[model samples]
Target: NRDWLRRDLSVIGFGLIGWLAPSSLPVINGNSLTGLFLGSIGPELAHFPTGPALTSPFWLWMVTWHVGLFIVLTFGQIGFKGRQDGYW
Candidate 1:
């Protein structure tokens, strides 16, 4: 039951958070090794441009990534248990 609840809540919460704040979250930057490959292309693609168009995409990319992470964490906490059964 808890697992089901967590899964449901995680989905719902993710959707709600995305709808509420789709452009104010922290996303991965290419400064790190993994980020270099997995980070949004907007930053790299817009490095040459010197205007909001270049910068805005990066911010939006970060926000979307962060929201996705939050949803994953929330589901993990709600569904996973540290016990032997693994259903908290």
Candidate 2:
């Protein structure tokens, strides 16, 4: 339990930070419709979920979640190993 605490907390913290940041899903200013980018930055690189939420490409949400699932399963296997060794 103690051993996995940090790992579990990390996932939750990361998720929240991602959810709270400014979302680029709005176009035409505050219309609130879809996920994208900021035009103010520049049209050349605009429309990309590449702003402060920047670090995270909004389109990558699916990719992150999918990878997360794999990560979770990998951790689960570790947990099983822990239980077997009483590491938990």
Q: Write the per-residue lDDT of candidate 2 for residues 28-70, one digit (tens) a residue.
A: 6656454323222333343446443445334454465446555
- Specify the poorest-scoring 10-residue window by lDDT in model 1: 30-39
Off by over 4 Å in 2: 1-59, 86-88
Please provide, for model 1 over 15-47, each residue's C-alpha lDDT reduced to its tens digit, 9 standing for 90 to 100.
Answer: 555444643444566344343233457656655
C-alpha-based local distance difference test score of model 2: 0.47
